[PDB]
Structure 1
Amino acid sequence: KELSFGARAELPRIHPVASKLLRLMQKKETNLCLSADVSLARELLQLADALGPSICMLKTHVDILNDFTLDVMKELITLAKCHEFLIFEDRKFADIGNTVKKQYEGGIFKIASWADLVNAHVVPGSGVVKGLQEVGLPLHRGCLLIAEMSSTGSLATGDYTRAAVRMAEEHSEFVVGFISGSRVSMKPEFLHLTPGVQLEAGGDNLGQQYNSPQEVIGKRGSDIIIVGRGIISAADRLEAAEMYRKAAWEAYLSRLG
């Protein structure tokens, strides 16, 4: 039998970060992750504040911010704490452990100092996880492994996907779930987050593909939708975020029974 988000938050093997996320999802009735792909700090913060109540998570690409400072991330954390959402930096770590460890802790972004969650490609082998966890475990953080991608021509299929699942299952002290297009693990202690979501069928001119919240949450068994342009390009971003939230939440309720 499928467990609710609230119950999954209490599973014996749950990671504290996944448990925190699952409890706010249940509390707020939201399984929407806003993708805030914006070029200005003030836009990031404005959106986080206005849409915070509607979202379980805010996904950042800090490298696209023309005016990133750690004082912007400090302010973001205050918003995350106030509205109750996790911060997920979509950094896509994708190299040897020695390197990604430095990229996660160091440099100007100091990602581990503010990001509840990060993600990593599995193509380098498990060293990518072992390096990240050297930094993330002391900082009480979690990681998502990229098991499938939303884009046309994606190579993250078949045996590659199976490899991501195995790596996750063997690094549960740090890995809390997946970026995927569908449920890829049978263990309920893992989260599935799915980008490439819009209400209407389509894609963009550079390989993005879209499926609806009901397809991805209801039919494919994923837990959370990640939505950028579907919301950000809308005239009314508050109504758009509420529409995606209600769509994802109802799809989850249906699948739950």
Structure 2
Amino acid sequence: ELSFGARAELPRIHPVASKLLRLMQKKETNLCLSADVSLARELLQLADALGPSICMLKTHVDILNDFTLDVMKELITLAKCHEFLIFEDRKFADIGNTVKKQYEGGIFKIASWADLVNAHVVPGSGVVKGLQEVGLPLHRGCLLIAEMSSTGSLATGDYTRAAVRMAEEHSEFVVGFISGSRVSMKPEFLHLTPGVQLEAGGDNLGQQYNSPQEVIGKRGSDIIIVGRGIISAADRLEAAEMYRKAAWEAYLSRL
């Protein structure tokens, strides 16, 4: 097992992964903020205040009531100032021909500002090939959704394995997974795990939570994705710090 810093230098490491792993080591953070807010000012205030505490900001641009490309320009400024990657949680899940247009075009022009995007493997490897035709020239990466956090999730067994194969066979664009645990034994791949809170529980629509120690420590993932655990707290800064120190120590102790 290697540190984030050593993993950033692996021969087969993707540039976007390497960038990520370098700033994770530098800033002592393996926390991805899930900025699930509907107003751009909120988004930008959270990105500014929490920037120093996070390795990555996961967006859902399609829930932003006042999206504009300028909001994303301002977000990029914050990402560069504070050193975090931008991850648009689009869950591409269509045929290659359709996802290609969805990633490059429309109002959102997701490929123009997102270091990372993600995709479901359900359509087969066409979904990755289609995204790649846009992502590769723009030097972007992709995460494949190998497991989900929600109750009744079908991303289990052979579906999970099928996700792992697809990532391994498309390593020039695929940099890792959204998963509940380590699913690949190859150190070049990132594992990012949502459905994380300090306290036990869930929501009224199928979400289930596990702690950072569980996820990073016992299950061997690299990075926690946390939304309401931070966003609903009163002091979002202290809450981010708490999650960061939780995920970081879990990591060091596993090392």
Q: Secondary structure at the match of 2:152?
A: coil
User: Once the two structures are superposed, what CA deviation does each residue of 1:60-101 show, in whole Å capped at 9, x if it has no partner?
Assistant: 000000000000001100000000000000000000000000
Residue 203 of structure 1 aligns to a residue whose secondary structure is coil
Residue 220 of structure 1 corresponds to 219
Q: Distance in 1 between matches of 2:107 and 2:137?
A: 20
Q: Distance in 2 between matches of 1:162 and 1:49?
A: 38
Partners in 2 of 1:245 and 1:13 — Cα distance? Answer: 28
Q: Secondary structure, in 3 states, of the residue corresponding to 2:33?
A: strand
Deviations 1:118-148 (A, max 9, x none): 0000000000000000000010000000000
SS at structure 1 position matched to 2:180: coil
Compute the displacement of 1:159 (Å).
0.2
CA distance in 1, matches of 2:141, 2:223: 16
User: 1:170, CA displacement in angstroms?
Assistant: 0.2
Following the alignment from structure 1 to structure 2, what is the Cα–Cα distance between the partners of residues 139 and 114?
10
Structure 2 distance, partners of 1:65, 1:238, is 21
User: 1:142: which partner in 2?
Assistant: 141
Q: Distance in 2 between matches of 1:26 and 1:199?
A: 23
Alpha-carbon distance in structure 1 between the residues aligned to 2:94 and 2:117: 14
1:185 shift after superposition: 0.2
User: Distance in 1 between the 2:61 and 2:107 partners?
Assistant: 10
Equivalent position of 2:32 in the other structure: 33
Partners of 2:230 and 2:240 lie apart in 1 by 6
Displacement of 1:249 in angstroms is: 0.0
Can you list the C-alpha shifts for 1:140-160, whole angstroms capped at 9, x where unaligned?
A: 000000000000000000000
Q: Secondary structure at the match of 2:247?
A: helix
Deviations 1:138-195 (A, max 9, x none): 1000000000000000000000000000000000000000000000000000000000
**For this pair of structures, how many residues does the alignment match?**
255
Q: C-alpha distance in 2, partners of 1:222/1:209? A: 17
- Measured after TM superposition, the shift of residue 12 of structure 1 is 0.1
Distance 1:235 1:70 in 2: 29
Identity of aligned residues (%): 100
Across the aligned residues of Structure 1 and Structure 2, the Cα RMSD in angstroms comes to 0.3
SS of residue in 2 equivalent to 1:49: helix
Q: Deviations over 1:184-230 (max 9, x none)?
A: 00000000000000001110000000000000000000000000000
Using the TM superposition, give the Cα deviation of residue 52 of structure 1 relative to its aligned residue in structure 2, in angstroms. Answer: 0.2
User: Cα offset for 1:24?
Assistant: 0.1
Deviation at 1:10, TM superposition (A): 0.2
Q: How much has 1:42 moved relative to structure 2? A: 0.6
Residues of 2 paired with 1:135 and 1:54: CA distance? 31
Distance in 1 between residues matched to 2:40 and 2:121, nearest whole Å: 30
- Give how far 1:236 is off: 0.6
Secondary structure at the aligned position of 1:254 is classed as helix
Q: Please state how far the C-alpha of 1:107 moved relative to its aligned partner.
A: 0.2
Distance 1:225 1:89 in 2: 15
The aligned runs of 1:94-243 (5 Å cut-off) are 94-243=93-242
In 2: Cα distance, 1:22 partner to 1:108 partner: 31
